Structures are given as structure tokens and as C-alpha cells.
């Protein structure tokens, strides 16, 4: 309410340090809900989202769902680039595939295209490139539609 | 797709008023609230379909009402009944630009009927699909669903010696954690309502890379038996 | 192209006013006049203004299609602009309703063999009221398209299906010989701004108090009427004690209800009195 982001940062850095992964995830998600549903000043919203992103990045173990929410809401290509940098440094293939699929399932087209182009320029693992291209996801959904079809043709007749 | 009851109560008078095109609009909208909903999920679903059949029949109805009922039947039983409309995004908060654009376009079919097909933009499949992640190959594995099987199922098809002699002488609703989890295969219809109750098996050749969040997205598993072969569902691109 | 159902005829203010003035002036003769406009496109038929054809001594039949008058009026209207086509004809059907007859069908056939997209707008000055001027264009069905049963109507829009065909119009045959059209009066800011002047009083009438003898006789008469109505109200309240609802639902049907009269008299005299006070004070202060 007071538009005091620095006080939020100080309180978070004071409290979350002496806490576990799950508890910090809970408090950060509560803060994210408050920012999403209550904050009106869009610039303040972007600021708090960015600081939450930084706090989750610095946190030892990171729940990538929260970072996915943050990068989706803020819609910043560089932040997702830093996220993928950290993920490739950790060399988590399953985490990489899951985060790429989640980003494909929910992201603005411009950000997705820019991130794919930058990842290709940096020459990441081609699995991430093809996944983020969007072809495998739509292909799998098409397969789901084709295999499990159930149509009431009699009703149409 | 939310299936909110109060909206249905408000729409109930609208679908029965004298004015025909209001009936058409109400019928189309009512099929947008109850998309991918079975009679077991909500008692009012079956009567709405009966009303749709009655309006499609009973030739003494205005053409606007006939068109509304036909398009409502088309929407309510969406493609293979395996796809829903989700203006809201997944666990995150997003408008999902494609869906909003498509539904704005579908609301424009008051001056161009061909534009009604634009609603196919917003159609989003309902699936909890698993992949190996090592090679992006779909495996076959069962998952636990802690709910009654009698709810999240496809609706039924369209249907239309003297004693013996004296014997004759005298003749003159929550479904919340119902336990007993039942296996659901991969690549199967997972309603967003039931997606929260979907759970994996603690022991399996494949274990999720993360904790399942009850959404309708893609979950990458982890091969705990990287040597043995298992049956793979082949994607349409795969056989070329 | 089998036409469409979203076709709309756009009638300007000039055309509609001339239509009504000419229709009311010839009751009950079905006067007819041409209709100068332009064909914007397949879906829109703009109409600029109309002019009247003379009514020959035929009576109640629309058959005077004199060509000399039409040619002269068209040629020497061009001298002062209005370079437009002969888009349609309008004829008034006073009293019956909006529907075409056999003679009307033949005349519209004659027009169609010249333009093939000629509307047949039918005014009706008799049954028109201030806000519901009844107007609806018509155009003949093709011919043997009834073998295809596809009378030229492609419902590519809901804008044409919203209008509902009249009951008595179907008796003469609406969807059998002439598919109906839509009517959309299109205005202009200049015209709607300044037609407001019909209800703008003269400036020198607001401050004009009327003679100060009638304003006292009226007050005295209103007070006497109030006294009598109050007495009737007293007897009404007395009589209402012993009456059952099935009578009160129909009791004051044929006799003066001495309550609405009281309220009406009070409101009317109070409004007149307030206006009188304000006028008197305003002139006493400002005029001096
Ligand atoms: Zn006539």
C-alpha cells in the first residue's frame, strides 16, 4: 500500500534466509498473488515482479513454477534468458524440457520467438530449440485429438 | 468452461423468452459454460441437451433459434469432446491472446456467419501428457486418480396332488478424495476439474521431474529404467 | 450472386419528410413518385431524395407512369445538382398496411426490367405515429428460383433476419413474390442539431407574464375544486371500509376517482404557481 518496495526487499531478505524451500515458496506465492490481483500502478507491478524474480533466482533451490509465472507476467526476454542460463549451468535436462513446455503452453508470441532466436544464437541444446519452437506440443495435442476421438455422429445426422 | 451455476440460473429465463435471437444467443452461451460437462457432473446438463434436441426438432421455431441450437450442440460436444475453452490460462495468470482473439471473433458472427469458425482458435485440449524427456518420446504409464470413476467419463451415446388341487381352489456431490484410486492411462481426457486429483505412482519406471500441479499441461518424467524398452505411443509426425 | 438478406435501404431525412408530406396530401389516392439515390454496393441502397409523379385521373390505382414528367424533372433537376439514378419508386398505401398488390407487382416488374435492383418502398401516412413511421422496401422474387426454393436470401448476417414479417402482409404474400428489405434512416449532425428548432420558443415569451386577473381566477377555481375533491375523498375513505377487493379492482371504472384528480390538481396548480412566482420575481429584479 505504501509503495515501499525496498522495505519488502529488506523484510524478505531478513526472513527467507532462515527458512526452507517450501515456506519461502509459500510466502513468495502470497506476495505474487497480492501483486497480481491488487497492485494497480503497472510500473510498481513490474518492479515488484522483477524483485521477486531476483529473490527466487538467488534462493538456493528454486521452484521453477514461480519463475515461470514471473516471466510470463512481466514478459521480459532477458529475464527468461537468465533463467535458461542458470538452468543450462545446472544441466537439468528434465527441468529444461519441463520449463520449455510450460513456457510454450503459456507465453506471448513475441517473447517466445525472441527467446528462441536468442537461444539458437547462443547455440543451446537443439532439444530446447525444437521444443520451444512449438511444433512438438501442437503435434502431441493433435495426436491426443486423433487417438481418443469420441464423436456423436448420430446427433449430427 | 468454469461451469458456474449462478450463470446458468441467470441464463435459464433468457433461453425461454419470446424473442428468438435472444434465445439463439442464450443457447450458444449456455453451451459455452457447460462445455465438457457430463450429466453426472451437473444434473441440469441432460435437460439442456433435451431442450437442444427439442428446438432442433419441432419445426415450428424461428430460424434464428434453430441456428442457435445447432451451433450450441456443435460447441457443447466439442471436437471429440476432448477439448475445452479456457480464456484464463494455466496455473499462471494470462489471457492467452489466441483464445481472447478467437472469442472476440466468434462474438462477431452477427454480420458474417463465416467468422463463426474463428472460435476454433480458442479450443484447447484437456490432457495430462507424459514424455520421457531423454528423447521426447511418449511412454505408456498408468496414473492414480483419487475420485469416483462414475463422474469423469464420456456421456452415453445418443439413444432414442389334492393339496395342489386345493392350492388353486383358494386362488379364486463432491467426489473429493474418494480413495480407491483407479488407473488412468497417459494421453487420456483429463478434465480441469479432475486434474487436481490426478496423481502418479510413487514406484514406476518413470517418475515426474517435478511435483504435479493439477494442471492440463505436459509433464516430463524421468526414466528410472534407462535400459529396458517400454511401449511408446507413436505421434502423428513420427510415422511421417 | 443471389442477393442477400442483409440488404438495407438508407433513407435520408429529406426523402422521408417528402414521402410523408406527399402521402398525407393524397389520402386515399395511392400517389406515387420516383426515388433519386445511388447503388453504393450489393448490400446497401442509398436514397438521397424523392420527387412526386402526378396522379392521373385513375382513382385508387398506381398506374400513372407518365414518362414526359419523369424525363423533364430528371433532366432539369441536373441543372442544380442531384445527379443520381432512378433507384426506386414509392407509393402510399393509406389505411391497409405495407404490402404490394398485383398492379404494384407489375409496376415493380417494369422498374426491374430497367434497373434490376429497384426497391418498392411503401409509405403509409395514415397509421404512422410520432416515433413509429411505418416504412419497408420491397423487391420482387426472381421467377423460377422457387424450383431451387432459394429465393435470393443468403443469411450471411443476422442483420436481416431480425425484422419480422407482418401478419396481414403475408396474406397478400410476402415471401411468395417479393422478399422484404430492411430500412435504416441515416441522419446527419447538421440536420438533427437544428430540427430541434421546432420546439424552441420565441425568446420574448419566457419573461412575458400573462394578465394578472386570470392567474387569480384560476387559483380560486382550483381551490374550490380542491375543496370539493377533498370532500369526495372523505366520502371515498368512508365508503372504502366495507368494500371487497373484487369491486375495488373495478370500482373506479366509470366514475371520477377522487384521488388522482386531487393529485393532478395539486401538481398542476403548483407548477403553474411556481412558474408565475419565478417569472414575476425574475422580471421584477432583472427588468428594473
Ligand atoms: Zn399499390
Swiss-Prot record, chain B:
Record note on modification: N-acetylated by NAT1.
Q: Which domain of life is it from?
A: Eukaryota
According to the record, where are the PC repeats?
A: 1-24, 25-62, 68-104
Query: What sections of the sequence does the record tag as coiled-coil?
Result: none
Biased composition of type Basic residues is found at 165-172
Q: How does it assemble?
A: Interacts with UBR1.
User: In the UniProt entry for this protein, what further remark is given in the free-text comments?
Assistant: Present with 4750 molecules/cell in log phase SD medium.
Q: What does this protein do?
A: Acts as a regulatory subunit of the 26S proteasome which is involved in the ATP-dependent degradation of ubiquitinated proteins.
Homology family: Belongs to the proteasome subunit S1 family.
Q: What is this protein called?
A: 26S proteasome regulatory subunit RPN2
Q: Which organism is it from?
A: Saccharomyces cerevisiae (strain ATCC 204508 / S288c)
Which gene produces this protein? RPN2
From Swiss-Prot, chain C:
Give binding positions for Zn(2+).
Answer: 91, 93, 104
- Superkingdom of origin organism: Eukaryota
Q: What residues does the MPN domain cover?
A: 9-144
Record Pfam families: JAB, RPN11_C
Cellular component terms per the entry's GO annotation: cytosol; mitochondrion; nucleus; proteasome complex; proteasome regulatory particle, lid subcomplex; proteasome storage granule
Kindly state which keywords UniProt assigns to this record, in alphabetical order: Acetylation, Hydrolase, Metal-binding, Metalloprotease, Protease, Proteasome, Thiol protease, Ubl conjugation pathway, Zinc
PTM text? N-acetylated by NAT3.
Catalytic activity, reaction form: Thiol-dependent hydrolysis of ester, thioester, amide, peptide and isopeptide bonds formed by the C-terminal Gly of ubiquitin (a 76-residue protein attached to proteins as an intracellular targeting signal)
Query: Single GO molecular-function term?
Result: metallopeptidase activity
Quote the InterPro entries the UniProt record gives.
JAMM/MPN+_dom, JAMM_MPN+_peptidase_M67A, MPN, RPN11_C
As recorded in UniProt, its EC number(s) are 3.4.19.12
Miscellaneous information on this protein = Present with 16400 molecules/cell in log phase SD medium.
Domain notes from UniProt: The JAMM motif is required for the deubiquitination and degradation of ubiquitinated substrates.
Matching PANTHER family: EUKARYOTIC TRANSLATION INITIATION FACTOR 3 -RELATED (PTHR10410)
Describe its partners and assembly state: Component of the lid subcomplex of the 19S proteasome regulatory particle complex (also named PA700 complex). The 26S proteasome consists of a 20S proteasome core and two 19S regulatory subunits. Interacts directly with RPN8 and STS1.
Q: State what this protein does.
A: Component of the lid subcomplex of the 26S proteasome, a multiprotein complex involved in the ATP-dependent degradation of ubiquitinated proteins. RPN11 is the only catalytically active member of the lid and serves as the essential deubiquitinase of the proteasome.
* Family to which this protein belongs: Belongs to the peptidase M67A family.
Protein name stated in the entry: Ubiquitin carboxyl-terminal hydrolase RPN11
* Organism of derivation: Saccharomyces cerevisiae (strain ATCC 204508 / S288c)
Q: What gene is behind this protein?
A: RPN11
Amino acid at each position: 500500500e505504501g509503495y515501499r518496495l525496498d522495505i519488502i526487499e529488506s523484510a524478505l531478505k531478513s526472513k527467507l534466509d532462515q527458512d526452507s524451500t517450501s515456506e519461502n515458496v509459500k510466502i513468495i506465492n502470497y506476495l505474487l498473488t497480492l501483486a497480481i490481483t491488487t497492485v494497480t500502478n503497472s510500473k510498481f507491478r513490474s518492479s515488484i515482479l522483477r524483485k521477486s524474480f531476483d529473490f527466487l533466482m538467488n534462493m538456493p533451490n528454486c521452484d521453477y513454477l514461480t519463475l515461470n509465472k514471473v516471466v510470463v507476467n512481466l514478459n521480459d526476454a532477458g529475464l527468461a534468458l537468465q533463467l535458461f542460463k542458470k538452468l543450462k549451468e545446472e544441466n537439468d535436462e528434465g527441468l529444461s524440457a519441463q520449463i520449455a513446455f510450460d513456457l510454450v503452453s503459456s507465453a506471448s508470441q513475441q517473447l517466445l520467438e525472441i527467446l528462441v532466436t536468442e537461444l539458437t544464437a547462443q547455440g543451446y541444446d537443439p532439444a530446447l530449440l525444437n521444443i520451444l519452437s512449438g511444433l512438438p506440443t501442437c503435434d502431441y495435442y493433435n495426436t491426443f485429438l486423433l487417438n481418443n476421438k469420441n464423436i456423436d455422429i448420430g446427433l449430427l445426422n | 468452461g468454469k461451469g458456474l451455476q449462478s450463470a446458468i440460473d441467470v441464463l435459464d429465463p433468457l433461453t425461454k423468452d419470446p424473442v428468438d435471437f435472444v434465445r439463439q444467443a442464450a443457447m450458444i452461451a449456455l453451451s459455452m459454460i457447460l462445455i465438457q460437462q457430463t450429466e453426472k457432473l451437473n444434473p441440469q446438463v441432460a435437460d439442456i441437451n433435451k431442450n437442444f434436441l427439442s428446438v432442433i426438432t419441432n419445426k415450428h421455431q424461428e430460424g434464428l433459434a434453430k441456428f442457435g441450437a445447432c451451433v450450441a450442440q456443435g460447441i457443447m460436444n466439442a471436437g471429440g469432446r476432448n477439448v475445452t475453452i479456457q480464456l484464463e490460462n494455466a496455473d499462471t495468470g494470462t489471457l492467452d491472446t489466441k483464445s481472447v482473439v478467437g472469442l472476440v471473433m466468434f462474438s462477431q458472427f452477427w454480420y458474417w456467419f463465416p467468422l463463426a469458425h474463428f472460435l476454433s482458435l480458442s479450443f484447447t485440449p484437456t490432457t495430462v501428457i507424459g514424455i520421457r524427456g531423454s528423447d521426447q518420446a511418449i511412454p505408456k504409464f498408468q496414473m492414480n486418480c483419487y475420485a469416483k470413476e462414475d463422474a469423469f467419463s464420456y456421456p452415453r451415446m445418443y439413444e432414442e396332488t389334492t393339496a395342489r388341487a386345493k392350492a388353486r381352489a383358494k386362488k379364486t456431490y463432491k467426489n473429493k478424495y474418494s480413495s480407491k484410486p483407479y488407473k488412468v492411462d497417459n494421453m487420456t481426457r483429463i478434465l480441469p476439474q479432475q486434474s487436481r486429483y490426478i496423481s502418479f505412482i510413487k514406484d514406476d519406471r518413470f517418475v515426474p521431474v517435478r511435483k504435479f500441479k493439477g494442471n492440463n499441461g505436459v509433464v516430463v518424467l524421468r526414466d528410472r529404467e534407462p535400459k529396458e524398452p517400454v511401449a511408446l505411443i507413436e505421434t502423428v509426425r513420427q510415422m511421417k | 450472386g443471389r442477393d442477400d438478406t442483409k440488404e438495407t435501404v438508407y433513407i435520408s431525412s429529406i426523402a422521408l419528410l417528402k414521402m410523408l408530406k406527399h402521402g398525407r396530401a393524397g389520402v386515399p389516392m395511392e400517389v406515387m413518385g420516383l426515388m433519386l439515390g445511388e447503388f453504393v454496393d450489393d448490400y446497401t441502397v442509398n436514397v438521397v431524395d424523392v420527387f412526386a409523379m402526378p396522379q392521373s385521373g385513375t382513382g385508387v390505382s398506381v398506374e400513372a407512369v407518365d414518362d414526359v414528367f419523369q424525363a423533364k424533372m430528371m433532366d432539369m433537376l441536373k441543372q442544380t445538382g442531384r445527379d443520381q439514378m432512378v433507384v426506386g419508386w414509392y407509393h402510399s398505401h393509406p389505411g391497409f398496411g405495407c404490402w404490394l398488390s398485383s398492379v404494384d407487382v407489375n409496376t415493380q416488374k417494369s422498374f426491374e426490367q430497367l434497373n434490376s435492383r429497384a426497391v418498392a418502398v411503401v409509405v403509409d401516412p395514415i397509421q404512422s405515429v410520432k416515433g413509429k413511421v411505418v416504412i419497408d422496401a420491397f423487391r420482387l422474387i426472381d421467377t423460377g428460383a422457387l424450383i431451387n426454393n432459394l429465393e435470393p436470401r443468403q443469411t450471411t448476417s443476422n442483420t436481416g433476419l431480425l425484422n419480422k414479417a407482418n401478419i396481414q402482409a403475408l396474406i397478400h404474400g410476402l415471401n411468395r413474390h417479393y422478399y422484404s428489405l430492411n430500412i435504416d434512416y441515416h441522419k446527419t449532425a447538421k440536420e438533427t442539431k437544428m430540427l430541434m428548432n421546432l420546439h424552441k420558443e420565441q425568446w420574448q415569451s419566457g419573461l412575458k407574464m400573462y394578465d394578472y386577473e386570470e392567474k387569480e381566477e384560476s387559483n380560486l377555481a382550483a381551490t374550490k375544486s380542491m375543496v370539493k375533491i377533498a370532500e369526495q375523498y372523505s366520502k371515498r375513505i368512508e365508503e372504502e371500509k366495507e368494500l371487497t377487493e373484487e369491486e375495488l379492482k373495478t370500482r373506479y371504472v366509470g366514475r371520477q376517482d377522487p384521488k388522482k384528480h386531487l393529485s393532478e390538481t395539486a401538481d398542476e396548480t403548483l407548477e403553474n404557481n411556481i412558474v408565475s412566482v419565478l417569472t414575476a420575481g425574475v422580471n421584477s429584479v432583472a427588468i428594473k
